[PDB]
């Protein structure tokens, strides 16, 4: 009946321009467009960090080297220190 149809029609006048269409909004003085799709579109990345973890910064892992590939000055010293330990061992 009509009293539901007219409020169903009312759903096709007041909120039809709200989200069903993009005719901004008549009852509201503040606009609907420059909040969610431009200011709050970056809103999720205005809550998290930008240009570091949304870009995600796929960074090359810092490379770690061996013991400088210099065995002679330490292996014999370790061998000399191994003599010291095994006397105490």
């Amino acid at each position: 009946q009509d009293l539901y149809l007219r409020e169903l029609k009312d759903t096709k006048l007041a909120p039809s321009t709200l989200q069903d269409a993009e005719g901004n909004v008549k009852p509201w003085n503040p606009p609907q467009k420059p909040n969610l799709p431009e200011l709050e579109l970056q809103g999720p990345e205005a809550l998290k960090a930008y240009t570091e973890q949304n870009v995600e910064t796929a960074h090359v892992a810092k490379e770690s080297e061996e013991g400088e590939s210099e065995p002679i000055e330490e292996d014999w010293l370790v061998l000399d220190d191994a003599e010291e330990t095994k006397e105490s061992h």
């Binding site: 009946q1 009509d2 709200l18 989200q19 969610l36 809550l47």
Partner: protein, 51 residues
């Protein structure tokens, strides 16, 4: 980017809540209140005539 969409779902219903305020304020300023009593009259006839 998911709960932002979820928050987008929740906020959208929230302005629809104040939209009903705009809707309901449109409901109270009509001569349909005069016309609506005829809606009961035809409806209540259809109700008991079923029995």
């Amino acid at each position: 980017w998911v709960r932002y969409e979820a928050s987008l779902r929740q906020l959208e219903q929230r302005q629809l809540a104040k939209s009903v305020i705009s809707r309901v304020q449109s409901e109270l300023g009509n001569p349909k209140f005069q016309e609506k009593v005829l809606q009961q009259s035809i409806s209540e006839i259809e109700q008991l005539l079923s029995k």
